mmCIF file of C-alpha atoms and ligand atoms in Angstrom:
data_model
loop_
_atom_site.group_PDB
_atom_site.id
_atom_site.type_symbol
_atom_site.label_atom_id
_atom_site.label_comp_id
_atom_site.label_asym_id
_atom_site.label_seq_id
_atom_site.Cartn_x
_atom_site.Cartn_y
_atom_site.Cartn_z
ATOM 1 C CA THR A 1 -46.350 -6.441 24.046
ATOM 2 C CA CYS A 2 -50.044 -6.968 25.031
ATOM 3 C CA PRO A 3 -51.685 -3.135 25.761
ATOM 4 C CA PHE A 4 -53.153 -2.090 28.460
ATOM 5 C CA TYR A 5 -56.596 -1.716 26.640
ATOM 6 C CA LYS A 6 -56.417 -5.345 26.144
ATOM 7 C CA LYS A 7 -56.033 -5.764 30.474
ATOM 8 C CA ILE A 8 -58.660 -6.176 32.956
ATOM 9 C CA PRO A 9 -57.229 -4.864 36.023
ATOM 10 C CA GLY A 10 -57.152 -6.667 39.356
ATOM 11 C CA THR A 11 -57.522 -10.331 37.349
ATOM 12 C CA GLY A 12 -55.259 -12.372 35.230
ATOM 13 C CA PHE A 13 -57.629 -11.448 32.561
ATOM 14 C CA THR A 14 -57.246 -10.440 29.619
ATOM 15 C CA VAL A 15 -59.600 -9.988 26.192
ATOM 16 C CA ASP A 16 -59.264 -10.415 22.458
ATOM 17 C CA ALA A 17 -55.039 -10.407 23.065
ATOM 18 C CA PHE A 18 -54.025 -13.208 21.050
ATOM 19 C CA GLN A 19 -51.517 -11.978 18.668
ATOM 20 C CA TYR A 20 -48.809 -11.061 21.555
ATOM 21 C CA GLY A 21 -47.681 -14.847 22.238
ATOM 22 C CA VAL A 22 -48.159 -15.899 26.024
ATOM 23 C CA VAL A 23 -48.827 -12.720 28.062
ATOM 24 C CA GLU A 24 -47.330 -12.860 31.406
ATOM 25 C CA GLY A 25 -49.975 -13.288 34.309
ATOM 26 C CA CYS A 26 -52.631 -14.288 32.153
ATOM 27 C CA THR A 27 -54.643 -17.156 33.597
ATOM 28 C CA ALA A 28 -57.723 -16.853 31.204
ATOM 29 C CA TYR A 29 -58.238 -15.245 27.582
ATOM 30 C CA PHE A 30 -61.773 -13.896 26.851
ATOM 31 C CA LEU A 31 -62.754 -14.092 22.909
ATOM 32 C CA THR A 32 -65.217 -11.317 22.251
ATOM 33 C CA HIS A 33 -66.316 -12.687 19.000
ATOM 34 C CA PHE A 34 -65.107 -14.400 15.521
ATOM 35 C CA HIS A 35 -63.858 -11.701 13.732
ATOM 36 C CA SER A 36 -59.874 -12.080 12.566
ATOM 37 C CA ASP A 37 -58.684 -8.603 13.955
ATOM 38 C CA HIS A 38 -59.941 -10.245 17.341
ATOM 39 C CA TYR A 39 -59.228 -13.678 17.277
ATOM 40 C CA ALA A 40 -55.530 -13.016 15.123
ATOM 41 C CA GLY A 41 -52.763 -15.373 16.784
ATOM 42 C CA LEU A 42 -55.334 -18.325 17.881
ATOM 43 C CA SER A 43 -54.506 -21.548 16.053
ATOM 44 C CA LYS A 44 -54.789 -25.767 16.728
ATOM 45 C CA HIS A 45 -51.364 -24.569 18.697
ATOM 46 C CA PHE A 46 -52.840 -22.635 21.360
ATOM 47 C CA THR A 47 -52.894 -24.444 24.666
ATOM 48 C CA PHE A 48 -54.404 -21.554 27.452
ATOM 49 C CA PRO A 49 -58.139 -21.765 28.450
ATOM 50 C CA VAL A 50 -60.503 -19.570 26.304
ATOM 51 C CA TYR A 51 -63.700 -17.986 27.327
ATOM 52 C CA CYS A 52 -66.480 -17.372 24.660
ATOM 53 C CA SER A 53 -69.896 -17.467 23.469
ATOM 54 C CA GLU A 54 -71.740 -21.232 22.470
ATOM 55 C CA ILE A 55 -71.325 -20.169 18.597
ATOM 56 C CA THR A 56 -67.922 -18.399 19.131
ATOM 57 C CA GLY A 57 -67.032 -22.206 20.658
ATOM 58 C CA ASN A 58 -68.405 -24.038 17.691
ATOM 59 C CA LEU A 59 -66.342 -21.914 15.305
ATOM 60 C CA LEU A 60 -63.277 -22.003 17.347
ATOM 61 C CA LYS A 61 -63.411 -25.840 17.080
ATOM 62 C CA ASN A 62 -64.465 -26.415 13.356
ATOM 63 C CA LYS A 63 -63.053 -23.324 11.465
ATOM 64 C CA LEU A 64 -59.742 -22.686 13.553
ATOM 65 C CA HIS A 65 -59.294 -26.028 14.814
ATOM 66 C CA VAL A 66 -58.485 -25.255 18.605
ATOM 67 C CA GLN A 67 -58.350 -28.018 20.630
ATOM 68 C CA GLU A 68 -61.732 -28.980 22.119
ATOM 69 C CA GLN A 69 -60.121 -29.099 25.742
ATOM 70 C CA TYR A 70 -58.965 -25.705 25.596
ATOM 71 C CA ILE A 71 -62.746 -24.244 24.713
ATOM 72 C CA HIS A 72 -64.832 -22.909 27.846
ATOM 73 C CA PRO A 73 -68.012 -21.786 26.393
ATOM 74 C CA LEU A 74 -70.518 -20.021 28.580
ATOM 75 C CA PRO A 75 -73.950 -19.308 28.323
ATOM 76 C CA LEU A 76 -75.643 -15.709 27.891
ATOM 77 C CA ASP A 77 -77.272 -13.721 31.072
ATOM 78 C CA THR A 78 -76.195 -15.884 33.263
ATOM 79 C CA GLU A 79 -73.980 -15.351 36.541
ATOM 80 C CA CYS A 80 -71.147 -17.392 35.608
ATOM 81 C CA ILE A 81 -67.642 -17.841 37.943
ATOM 82 C CA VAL A 82 -64.325 -17.480 35.845
ATOM 83 C CA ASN A 83 -61.131 -18.372 38.255
ATOM 84 C CA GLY A 84 -62.686 -17.178 41.457
ATOM 85 C CA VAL A 85 -64.352 -13.902 39.499
ATOM 86 C CA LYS A 86 -68.168 -13.458 38.759
ATOM 87 C CA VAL A 87 -68.803 -12.654 35.050
ATOM 88 C CA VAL A 88 -71.754 -12.283 33.198
ATOM 89 C CA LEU A 89 -71.617 -12.720 28.843
ATOM 90 C CA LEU A 90 -74.515 -10.189 27.240
ATOM 91 C CA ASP A 91 -75.565 -10.011 23.723
ATOM 92 C CA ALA A 92 -73.511 -7.201 21.491
ATOM 93 C CA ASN A 93 -75.935 -7.503 19.014
ATOM 94 C CA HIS A 94 -72.915 -7.272 16.667
ATOM 95 C CA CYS A 95 -71.964 -10.806 14.398
ATOM 96 C CA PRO A 96 -73.477 -14.077 15.447
ATOM 97 C CA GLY A 97 -72.282 -15.339 18.914
ATOM 98 C CA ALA A 98 -70.497 -11.750 19.519
ATOM 99 C CA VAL A 99 -70.674 -10.707 23.260
ATOM 100 C CA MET A 100 -70.034 -7.755 25.625
ATOM 101 C CA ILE A 101 -68.626 -8.934 29.465
ATOM 102 C CA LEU A 102 -69.230 -7.856 32.565
ATOM 103 C CA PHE A 103 -66.564 -8.153 35.521
ATOM 104 C CA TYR A 104 -67.360 -7.818 38.831
ATOM 105 C CA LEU A 105 -63.757 -7.335 40.592
ATOM 106 C CA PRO A 106 -63.413 -8.340 43.846
ATOM 107 C CA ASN A 107 -62.720 -4.812 45.406
ATOM 108 C CA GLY A 108 -65.981 -3.981 44.255
ATOM 109 C CA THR A 109 -65.223 -2.082 41.110
ATOM 110 C CA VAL A 110 -67.502 -3.321 37.760
ATOM 111 C CA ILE A 111 -66.421 -3.275 34.419
ATOM 112 C CA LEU A 112 -67.994 -3.454 31.010
ATOM 113 C CA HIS A 113 -66.365 -4.493 28.054
ATOM 114 C CA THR A 114 -68.522 -4.119 25.079
ATOM 115 C CA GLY A 115 -66.205 -5.828 22.454
ATOM 116 C CA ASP A 116 -67.173 -4.721 19.183
ATOM 117 C CA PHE A 117 -71.143 -3.899 19.445
ATOM 118 C CA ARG A 118 -74.077 -1.528 18.077
ATOM 119 C CA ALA A 119 -76.005 0.168 21.125
ATOM 120 C CA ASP A 120 -79.313 -0.458 21.238
ATOM 121 C CA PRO A 121 -82.226 1.001 23.854
ATOM 122 C CA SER A 122 -83.075 -2.722 24.770
ATOM 123 C CA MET A 123 -79.631 -3.001 26.356
ATOM 124 C CA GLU A 124 -80.857 -0.110 28.926
ATOM 125 C CA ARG A 125 -83.326 -2.895 30.336
ATOM 126 C CA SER A 126 -80.293 -6.077 30.881
ATOM 127 C CA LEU A 127 -78.346 -6.749 33.993
ATOM 128 C CA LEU A 128 -76.267 -3.665 33.656
ATOM 129 C CA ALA A 129 -79.366 -1.579 35.018
ATOM 130 C CA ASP A 130 -79.444 -3.589 38.429
ATOM 131 C CA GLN A 131 -75.813 -1.722 39.645
ATOM 132 C CA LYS A 132 -73.327 0.900 38.976
ATOM 133 C CA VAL A 133 -70.515 0.482 35.969
ATOM 134 C CA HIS A 134 -66.932 2.423 36.836
ATOM 135 C CA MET A 135 -65.503 1.537 34.092
ATOM 136 C CA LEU A 136 -65.938 0.990 29.970
ATOM 137 C CA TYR A 137 -63.945 -0.545 27.577
ATOM 138 C CA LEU A 138 -65.330 0.864 24.535
ATOM 139 C CA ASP A 139 -66.249 0.260 20.273
ATOM 140 C CA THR A 140 -65.063 3.747 19.275
ATOM 141 C CA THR A 141 -65.562 2.796 15.952
ATOM 142 C CA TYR A 142 -67.813 5.496 14.656
ATOM 143 C CA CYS A 143 -67.252 7.977 17.629
ATOM 144 C CA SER A 144 -67.641 11.122 15.191
ATOM 145 C CA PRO A 145 -70.766 12.981 14.858
ATOM 146 C CA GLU A 146 -70.624 12.462 10.519
ATOM 147 C CA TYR A 147 -71.430 8.867 11.449
ATOM 148 C CA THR A 148 -75.191 8.237 10.630
ATOM 149 C CA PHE A 149 -77.254 5.349 9.616
ATOM 150 C CA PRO A 150 -80.616 4.139 9.213
ATOM 151 C CA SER A 151 -81.910 1.102 10.978
ATOM 152 C CA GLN A 152 -81.303 -2.518 10.641
ATOM 153 C CA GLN A 153 -84.840 -3.160 9.797
ATOM 154 C CA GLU A 154 -85.064 0.135 7.147
ATOM 155 C CA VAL A 155 -82.115 -1.289 5.554
ATOM 156 C CA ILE A 156 -83.681 -5.197 5.320
ATOM 157 C CA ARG A 157 -87.144 -3.500 4.153
ATOM 158 C CA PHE A 158 -85.770 -1.744 1.299
ATOM 159 C CA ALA A 159 -83.336 -4.774 0.153
ATOM 160 C CA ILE A 160 -86.443 -7.353 0.568
ATOM 161 C CA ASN A 161 -88.724 -4.805 -1.708
ATOM 162 C CA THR A 162 -86.430 -4.323 -4.202
ATOM 163 C CA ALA A 163 -85.427 -7.883 -4.762
ATOM 164 C CA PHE A 164 -88.969 -8.845 -4.815
ATOM 165 C CA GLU A 165 -89.959 -6.715 -7.708
ATOM 166 C CA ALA A 166 -86.737 -7.515 -10.134
ATOM 167 C CA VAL A 167 -87.510 -11.412 -9.792
ATOM 168 C CA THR A 168 -91.649 -10.562 -10.613
ATOM 169 C CA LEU A 169 -90.404 -8.668 -13.370
ATOM 170 C CA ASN A 170 -87.810 -11.069 -14.504
ATOM 171 C CA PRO A 171 -87.931 -14.759 -13.484
ATOM 172 C CA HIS A 172 -84.595 -15.569 -14.735
ATOM 173 C CA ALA A 173 -82.606 -13.122 -12.770
ATOM 174 C CA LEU A 174 -80.760 -14.221 -9.801
ATOM 175 C CA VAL A 175 -79.777 -12.306 -6.820
ATOM 176 C CA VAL A 176 -76.273 -12.308 -5.424
ATOM 177 C CA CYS A 177 -75.022 -11.059 -1.953
ATOM 178 C CA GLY A 178 -71.448 -10.243 -1.380
ATOM 179 C CA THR A 179 -70.173 -11.418 2.250
ATOM 180 C CA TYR A 180 -66.312 -11.621 3.679
ATOM 181 C CA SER A 181 -66.965 -12.848 7.489
ATOM 182 C CA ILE A 182 -69.749 -13.713 9.613
ATOM 183 C CA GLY A 183 -72.199 -10.822 10.188
ATOM 184 C CA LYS A 184 -74.901 -9.254 8.177
ATOM 185 C CA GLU A 185 -76.822 -12.528 7.608
ATOM 186 C CA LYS A 186 -79.633 -10.964 7.451
ATOM 187 C CA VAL A 187 -79.264 -9.447 4.352
ATOM 188 C CA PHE A 188 -79.619 -12.651 2.434
ATOM 189 C CA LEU A 189 -81.987 -14.566 5.062
ATOM 190 C CA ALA A 190 -84.320 -11.969 4.130
ATOM 191 C CA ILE A 191 -83.985 -11.631 0.706
ATOM 192 C CA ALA A 192 -84.635 -15.745 -0.020
ATOM 193 C CA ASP A 193 -87.408 -15.881 2.418
ATOM 194 C CA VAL A 194 -89.404 -13.352 0.294
ATOM 195 C CA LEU A 195 -88.326 -15.221 -3.087
ATOM 196 C CA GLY A 196 -89.202 -18.626 -1.725
ATOM 197 C CA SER A 197 -85.803 -19.785 -1.881
ATOM 198 C CA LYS A 198 -82.722 -21.234 -0.331
ATOM 199 C CA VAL A 199 -79.029 -19.289 -0.337
ATOM 200 C CA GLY A 200 -76.503 -21.057 -2.070
ATOM 201 C CA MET A 201 -72.747 -21.211 -1.528
ATOM 202 C CA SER A 202 -69.753 -22.663 -1.442
ATOM 203 C CA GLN A 203 -68.518 -25.399 0.773
ATOM 204 C CA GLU A 204 -66.493 -23.391 3.016
ATOM 205 C CA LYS A 205 -69.031 -20.439 3.665
ATOM 206 C CA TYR A 206 -71.738 -23.196 4.574
ATOM 207 C CA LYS A 207 -69.380 -24.896 6.984
ATOM 208 C CA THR A 208 -69.282 -21.398 8.632
ATOM 209 C CA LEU A 209 -73.249 -21.294 8.509
ATOM 210 C CA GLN A 210 -73.551 -24.378 10.000
ATOM 211 C CA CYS A 211 -71.893 -23.346 13.560
ATOM 212 C CA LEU A 212 -74.243 -20.062 14.150
ATOM 213 C CA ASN A 213 -77.039 -22.074 16.100
ATOM 214 C CA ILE A 214 -79.867 -20.466 13.601
ATOM 215 C CA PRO A 215 -83.025 -22.214 14.110
ATOM 216 C CA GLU A 216 -84.352 -24.265 10.827
ATOM 217 C CA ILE A 217 -80.834 -23.591 9.234
ATOM 218 C CA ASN A 218 -80.959 -26.594 7.034
ATOM 219 C CA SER A 219 -84.457 -25.278 5.511
ATOM 220 C CA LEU A 220 -82.481 -22.183 4.419
ATOM 221 C CA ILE A 221 -79.407 -22.957 3.148
ATOM 222 C CA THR A 222 -77.859 -25.442 0.483
ATOM 223 C CA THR A 223 -74.501 -25.901 -1.448
ATOM 224 C CA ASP A 224 -76.642 -26.862 -4.506
ATOM 225 C CA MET A 225 -76.079 -23.357 -6.216
ATOM 226 C CA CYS A 226 -78.213 -24.699 -9.620
ATOM 227 C CA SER A 227 -81.275 -25.282 -7.242
ATOM 228 C CA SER A 228 -81.307 -21.529 -5.609
ATOM 229 C CA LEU A 229 -82.055 -17.778 -6.671
ATOM 230 C CA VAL A 230 -80.086 -16.302 -4.013
ATOM 231 C CA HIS A 231 -76.005 -17.024 -3.997
ATOM 232 C CA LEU A 232 -73.535 -15.747 -1.551
ATOM 233 C CA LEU A 233 -70.116 -14.688 -3.147
ATOM 234 C CA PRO A 234 -66.800 -13.043 -1.868
ATOM 235 C CA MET A 235 -67.698 -8.947 -1.662
ATOM 236 C CA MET A 236 -64.399 -8.819 -3.810
ATOM 237 C CA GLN A 237 -66.161 -10.678 -6.803
ATOM 238 C CA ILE A 238 -68.986 -8.094 -6.293
ATOM 239 C CA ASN A 239 -68.327 -6.163 -9.510
ATOM 240 C CA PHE A 240 -69.336 -6.094 -13.447
ATOM 241 C CA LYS A 241 -66.549 -8.210 -14.037
ATOM 242 C CA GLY A 242 -67.358 -10.947 -11.374
ATOM 243 C CA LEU A 243 -70.694 -10.858 -11.738
ATOM 244 C CA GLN A 244 -71.060 -11.554 -15.543
ATOM 245 C CA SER A 245 -68.127 -14.226 -14.981
ATOM 246 C CA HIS A 246 -70.499 -16.168 -12.445
ATOM 247 C CA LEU A 247 -73.511 -15.583 -14.747
ATOM 248 C CA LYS A 248 -71.537 -17.503 -17.404
ATOM 249 C CA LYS A 249 -71.075 -20.348 -14.994
ATOM 250 C CA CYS A 250 -74.708 -21.050 -14.035
ATOM 251 C CA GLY A 251 -75.544 -22.792 -17.517
ATOM 252 C CA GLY A 252 -77.792 -19.975 -18.749
ATOM 253 C CA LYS A 253 -80.443 -20.572 -16.185
ATOM 254 C CA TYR A 254 -80.234 -16.905 -15.134
ATOM 255 C CA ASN A 255 -79.925 -14.392 -18.201
ATOM 256 C CA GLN A 256 -79.742 -11.192 -15.183
ATOM 257 C CA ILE A 257 -78.247 -10.607 -11.910
ATOM 258 C CA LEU A 258 -79.285 -8.292 -9.233
ATOM 259 C CA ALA A 259 -76.342 -7.626 -6.630
ATOM 260 C CA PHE A 260 -76.031 -6.151 -3.056
ATOM 261 C CA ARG A 261 -72.896 -4.972 -1.514
ATOM 262 C CA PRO A 262 -73.535 -4.844 2.131
ATOM 263 C CA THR A 263 -70.841 -2.143 3.789
ATOM 264 C CA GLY A 264 -69.978 0.355 6.697
ATOM 265 C CA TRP A 265 -70.420 4.002 6.211
ATOM 266 C CA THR A 266 -68.866 5.637 3.078
ATOM 267 C CA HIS A 267 -69.071 9.510 2.276
ATOM 268 C CA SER A 268 -72.909 9.476 0.753
ATOM 269 C CA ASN A 269 -74.493 8.694 4.513
ATOM 270 C CA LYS A 270 -74.594 12.531 4.494
ATOM 271 C CA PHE A 271 -77.179 13.244 2.033
ATOM 272 C CA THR A 272 -79.182 10.462 0.987
ATOM 273 C CA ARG A 273 -82.054 8.642 2.786
ATOM 274 C CA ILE A 274 -82.482 4.816 1.982
ATOM 275 C CA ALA A 275 -85.580 5.363 0.300
ATOM 276 C CA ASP A 276 -83.649 7.737 -2.393
ATOM 277 C CA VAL A 277 -80.857 4.859 -2.936
ATOM 278 C CA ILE A 278 -80.324 3.928 -6.840
ATOM 279 C CA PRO A 279 -78.012 1.226 -8.328
ATOM 280 C CA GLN A 280 -75.193 1.228 -10.408
ATOM 281 C CA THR A 281 -75.809 -0.459 -13.817
ATOM 282 C CA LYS A 282 -73.750 -2.170 -16.772
ATOM 283 C CA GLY A 283 -76.306 -4.086 -19.306
ATOM 284 C CA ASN A 284 -78.026 -6.789 -17.633
ATOM 285 C CA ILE A 285 -76.369 -6.630 -14.153
ATOM 286 C CA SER A 286 -77.405 -4.261 -11.398
ATOM 287 C CA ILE A 287 -75.608 -3.376 -8.045
ATOM 288 C CA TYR A 288 -76.911 -1.563 -4.809
ATOM 289 C CA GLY A 289 -74.879 -0.204 -2.065
ATOM 290 C CA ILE A 290 -76.357 -0.809 1.319
ATOM 291 C CA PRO A 291 -75.333 0.719 4.370
ATOM 292 C CA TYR A 292 -76.098 -2.181 6.856
ATOM 293 C CA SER A 293 -73.924 -1.443 10.293
ATOM 294 C CA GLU A 294 -73.236 -3.942 13.092
ATOM 295 C CA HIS A 295 -71.465 -1.239 14.766
ATOM 296 C CA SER A 296 -72.745 1.945 16.739
ATOM 297 C CA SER A 297 -73.766 5.085 15.089
ATOM 298 C CA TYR A 298 -72.599 8.363 17.121
ATOM 299 C CA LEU A 299 -76.096 9.061 18.078
ATOM 300 C CA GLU A 300 -76.585 5.349 19.417
ATOM 301 C CA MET A 301 -72.854 5.250 21.015
ATOM 302 C CA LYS A 302 -73.722 8.469 23.123
ATOM 303 C CA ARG A 303 -76.850 7.479 24.321
ATOM 304 C CA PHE A 304 -75.778 4.105 25.422
ATOM 305 C CA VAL A 305 -72.711 6.259 27.375
ATOM 306 C CA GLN A 306 -74.728 9.027 28.960
ATOM 307 C CA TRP A 307 -77.387 6.319 30.261
ATOM 308 C CA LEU A 308 -74.455 3.932 31.500
ATOM 309 C CA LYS A 309 -72.686 7.365 33.104
ATOM 310 C CA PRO A 310 -69.224 5.615 33.543
ATOM 311 C CA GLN A 311 -66.576 7.187 35.847
ATOM 312 C CA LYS A 312 -63.889 6.338 33.227
ATOM 313 C CA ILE A 313 -63.722 5.467 29.359
ATOM 314 C CA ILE A 314 -61.118 3.080 27.657
ATOM 315 C CA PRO A 315 -61.271 3.260 23.923
ATOM 316 C CA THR A 316 -60.777 -0.149 22.166
ATOM 317 C CA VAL A 317 -60.703 1.450 18.599
ATOM 318 C CA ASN A 318 -58.588 3.806 16.623
ATOM 319 C CA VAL A 319 -56.416 4.090 19.531
ATOM 320 C CA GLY A 320 -53.087 3.992 17.406
ATOM 321 C CA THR A 321 -52.761 7.918 16.739
ATOM 322 C CA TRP A 322 -52.581 10.794 19.448
ATOM 323 C CA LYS A 323 -55.134 12.856 16.942
ATOM 324 C CA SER A 324 -57.902 10.125 17.124
ATOM 325 C CA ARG A 325 -57.381 9.520 21.134
ATOM 326 C CA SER A 326 -57.537 13.257 21.469
ATOM 327 C CA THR A 327 -60.778 14.006 19.231
ATOM 328 C CA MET A 328 -62.679 10.757 21.168
ATOM 329 C CA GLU A 329 -61.583 12.521 24.617
ATOM 330 C CA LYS A 330 -63.313 15.385 23.738
ATOM 331 C CA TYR A 331 -66.784 14.013 22.813
ATOM 332 C CA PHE A 332 -66.363 11.922 26.462
ATOM 333 C CA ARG A 333 -66.088 15.645 28.179
ATOM 334 C CA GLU A 334 -68.979 17.104 26.001
ATOM 335 C CA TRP A 335 -71.270 13.718 26.685
ATOM 336 C CA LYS A 336 -70.376 14.086 30.474
ATOM 337 C CA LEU A 337 -70.875 17.670 30.651
ATOM 338 C CA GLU A 338 -74.115 17.390 28.969
ATOM 339 C CA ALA A 339 -75.401 14.863 31.457
ATOM 340 C CA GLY A 340 -74.034 16.023 34.478
ATOM 341 C CA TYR A 341 -71.671 12.526 35.671
HETATM 342 NI NI1 NI B 1 -66.421 -6.969 14.559
#
């Protein structure tokens, strides 16, 4: 049965709750973003109203084949009414089309659901600042002080300079970027832009990108691999074996590969700076691990919550074990004692 953390009290709404069949009492199903854990259970067979951003709606329509009659896309930063309740969608700074949802309940309680998010100080001057928020449903992916990472911009700068140097040193080198879902598109778009190239990719991946309302997209991406010096492949192929194999497929148009694996956090964030990063190398193939995160670091999450000052926090990630929940509760109390709410 549908957990309490996916239900919004005093409404018949749910959020990211598609895997439990028909939820008793639910009149509107919200979807924060197009990642499989969150959309799990949605298919052409779903027949209830789904509320989401325009980008998330395009994906639902085209990739999952959800019938158009059940898709209700809403604009961002706009007060809207859904089944008699005032809502607002905000940019979550996660992947394309990802939203936080602000619910203004009839009793006067205000609830923010973050979905998946990367907290940023620009969220402190949105519509969130206009009134008190009583309850917060929080993306707690990295809710522990060991989780630090560089800014997105530091990581992109490093990627840009690295790729530019390698291809100027060897103009027959190919750049590859690994991917598994939507998100982290700036990695491959910024590399291509500095190399004067389109990004080449499979038909399934191109169809995904064509849904994302990215301006001038037809000038940036192609299905013609041969014409392009940045290629996208599945994350699972980003290894010496997979990359040599792909290099054979391109017809000796390239004689070297430089590959990037954008990851989350891994244990080497605790010592290294982005400037110190060095690749793994076997022969004419180099692989760089780069920590490009679309979730809040501990410090970004703590700042956001200390600013927002919610009366209650409901975690939405790592809620499966008592140890995790207990640990998280501990950090929420510290934050509250330091900031005086
Ligand atoms: Ni996500």
